[PDB]
UniProtKB/TrEMBL annotation:
Function: Acts as a cofactor for the NS3 protease activity. Induces a specific membrane alteration that serves as a scaffold for the virus replication complex. Antagonizes host cell apoptosis by interacting with host ferritin heavy chain. The ORF4 protein physically binds host FTH1/FHC, resulting in the reduction of FTH1 protein levels in host cells. Reduction of FTH1 concentration further inhibits the accumulation of reactive oxygen in host cells, leading to reduced apoptosis.
Quaternary assembly: Interacts with RNA-directed RNA polymerase. Interacts with host RSAD2; this interaction inhibits viral replication. Interacts (via N-terminus) with host SP1; this interaction induces proteasomal degradation of SP1 with subsequent down-regulation of HDAC1 and ISG15 expression thereby counteracting the host innate immunity. Interacts (via C-terminus) with host IRF3.
Family affiliation: Belongs to the pestivirus polyprotein family.
Residue span(s) of domain RdRp catalytic: 322-445
Residue ranges that the Swiss-Prot or TrEMBL entry lists as coiled coil: none
Protein name: Genome polyprotein
Annotated localization: Host cell surface; Host cytoplasm; Host membrane; Virion membrane
Length: 647
């Protein structure tokens, strides 16, 4: 009866190792009585206990006392600064004002010297149909400096999470089972041309950096190569990261993205090393941080969003009663421990050539304890954790996440590490992800996994009944802020597309953070993902019919060469005209938020179709005739030119 209070309390106990020297009892076992707790040091949901005719309520109180005693005996151990970073001291000009409780705020340096706006064409397309933009949810809002200081105190300002003893030994036991020995010690850095190929010249400037990436590349490339050598030999350098709030002017991505969802998952606190330091890290570790080739099992950072759910359902279909168990770690970046970072270090040393291990052993040391500069000049010393702007973020988090989840899953079920790829499939993109396995294993892992994942220091989001999110049918999987939605093509074949709430799609489509060429690029980018949504599909076509003489802009996720309907068929595998049905039920779910907020009218759907037909019945070759129902209504079809989709 009193069993849950033990389970909730067990999520607060310090991680311990196997203690065979005493009796280790379960949370349900404690609720049965005749058991008095002997230590709040917990291991796999068990604690050392003695049998002594106890009342349950007493056992909890002794545990509450055991835990409270330790909490007031293991708080403020103390923050220390590493010598290799002493150089930052000489830069303080004023006293510190962060009022941090767990990390040093040694002072402030001297300072140096964006709005949410609507896309004029798209927005005029929506409004003309009765969509009320004001009713759409806010997206990509910025935050004030006072919330920023409190945000850092709220989420960053935390000591490293305690982890189970010897864990990283076990995590290496898992990695050895999925190493790719045909590549051991085979990675080398790439040359300047390969690095500059896929790069944004507008890469974010450091706090002490004046020039962007494109400027740093065009003129100070020699400076970057100097950084590498000092690291190549194990020499300290001026490592610092700049802290700005998400959607500040310098929240700019160095590398390509798969969609707007990546920006949505960025923490409230963006932390990145200098443009020059990022370039040095990227030129050296290119094959890792960009996962070329992919050696992280189930890493979907390169999988385009329109492929992922087709790719997964092919795995889904091979199980007897599959479930998908979601990973939902609370603010992952703040939970990377120092010991976790050397686990990636020891892994990066595995795949890199012998001539770079000193580089890695050194750069890890800096990342063990990083000096960070706020936008306003306040300086704090972060104990470990992952900076969202580091080049190793997605690569390092992803490989970190798989090992951690496999450990939690395998130890929860009894499945041996070497047998995993046989009884389960996993897919991750940074901290977000899930695993597929049989309902038996999935329900077992989902119930015990929350506590185990607390013992490894990756606490999950508080959920109902302390159980991980379990998907029992395919299109309930949630991944990368999207979810599978079925479509049936004209040839009676089925595929899945990335589904998402209609409200969210409209908002992210109608806005930007501070031209008509751009809006056609957005229209195409959204069309590749959301052609299942008849509202979006037709809005997108209308924008594409707008001033056909203009070429599409190239600043966003995708753009097209030539006729766009061809580009759709090139990557999707079917012509847009072949979309005959969108999954009936799932569309109802995703459109509900539209009616919840009242963002549309009872005739909005019809007014949009009727708006598209008006442009479509006129004689000639019109984009809107790609829509099967529009073409069914106009009697004419769209005949595509040549087309190609490019990033």
């Amino acid at each position: 009866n009193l069993t849950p209070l033990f389970e909730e309390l067990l999520q607060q106990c310090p991680p311990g190792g196997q203690n065979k020297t005493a009796h280790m009892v379960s949370a349900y076992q404690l609720a049965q009585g005749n058991w008095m707790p002997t230590s709040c040091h917990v291991f796999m949901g068990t604690i050392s206990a003695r049998r002594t005719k106890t009342h349950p309520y007493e056992a909890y109180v002794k545990l509450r006392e055991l835990v409270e005693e330790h909490k007031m005996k293991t708080l403020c151990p103390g923050s220390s600064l590493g010598k290799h970073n002493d150089w930052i001291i000489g830069k303080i000009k004023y006293q510190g004002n962060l009022r941090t409780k767990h990390m040093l705020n040694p002072g402030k340096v001297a300072e140096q010297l964006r709005h949410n706006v609507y896309n004029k064409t798209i927005g005029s397309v929506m409004t003309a149909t009765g969509i009320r933009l004001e009713k759409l949810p806010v997206v990509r809002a910025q935050t004030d400096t006072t919330n920023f200081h409190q945000a850092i105190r709220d989420k960053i300002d935390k000591e490293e999470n305690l982890q189970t003893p010897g864990l990283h030994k076990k995590l290496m036991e898992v990695f050895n089972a999925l190493k790719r020995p045909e590549l051991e010690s085979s990675y080398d850095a790439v040359e300047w041309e390969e690095l500059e190929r896929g790069i944004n010249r507008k890469g974010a400037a450091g706090f002490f950096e004046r020039k962007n990436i494109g400027e740093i590349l065009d003129s100070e490339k020699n400076k970057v190569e100097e950084i590498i050598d000092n690291l190549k030999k194990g020499r300290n350098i001026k490592y610092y990261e700049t802290a700005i709030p998400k959607n500040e002017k310098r929240d700019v991505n160095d590398d390509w993205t798969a969609g707007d969802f990546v920006d949505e998952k960025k923490p409230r606190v963006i932390q990145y090393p200098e443009a020059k330091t990022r370039l040095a890290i990227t030129k050296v570790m290119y094959k890792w941080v960009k996962q070329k080739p992919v050696v992280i099992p189930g890493y979907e950072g390169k999988t385009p969003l329109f492929q992922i759910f087709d790719k997964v359902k092919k795995e889904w279909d091979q199980f007897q009663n599959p479930v998908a168990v979601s990973f939902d770690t609370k603010a992952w970046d703040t939970q990377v421990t120092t010991k976790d970072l050397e686990l990636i270090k020891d892994i990066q040393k595995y795949y890199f050539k012998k001539k770079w291990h000193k580089f890695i052993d050194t750069l890890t040391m800096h990342m063990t304890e990083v000096p960070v500069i706020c936008a306003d000049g306040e300086v704090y010393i972060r104990k470990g954790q992952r900076g969202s702007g580091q080049p190793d973020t997605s690569a390092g988090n992803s490989m970190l996440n798989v090992l951690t989840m496999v450990y939690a899953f395998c130890e929860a079920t009894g499945v041996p590490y070497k047998s995993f790829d046989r009884v389960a499939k996993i897919h991750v993109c940074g901290d977000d992800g899930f695993l597929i396995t049989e309902r038996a294993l999935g329900e077992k892992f989902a119930s015990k996994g929350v506590q185990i994942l607390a013992e490894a220091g990756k606490p999950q989001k508080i959920t109902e009944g302390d159980k991980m999110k379990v998907a029992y049918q395919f299109d309930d999987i949630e991944f990368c802020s999207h979810t599978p939605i079925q479509v049936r093509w004209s040839d009676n074949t089925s595929s899945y597309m990335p589904g998402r709430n209609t409200t969210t799609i409209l908002a992210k489509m109608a806005t930007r953070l501070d031209t008509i060429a751009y809006e056609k690029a957005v229209a195409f980018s959204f069309l590749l993902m959301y052609s299942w949504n008849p509202l979006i599909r037709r809005i997108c076509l209308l924008v594409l019919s707008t001033e056909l003489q203009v070429k599409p802009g190239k600043s966003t996720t995708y753009y097209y060469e030539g006729d766009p309907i061809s580009a759709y068929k090139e990557v999707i595998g079917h012509n847009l005209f072949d979309l005959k049905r969108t999954s009936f039920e799932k569309l109802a779910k995703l459109n509900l938020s539209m009616s919840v907020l009242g963002a549309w009218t009872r005739h909005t759907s019809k007014r949009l179709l009727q708006d598209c037909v008006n442009m479509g019945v006129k004689e000639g070759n019109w984009l809107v005739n790609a829509d099967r129902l529009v073409s069914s209504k106009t009697g004419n079809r769209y005949i595509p030119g040549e087309g190609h989709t490019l990033q």
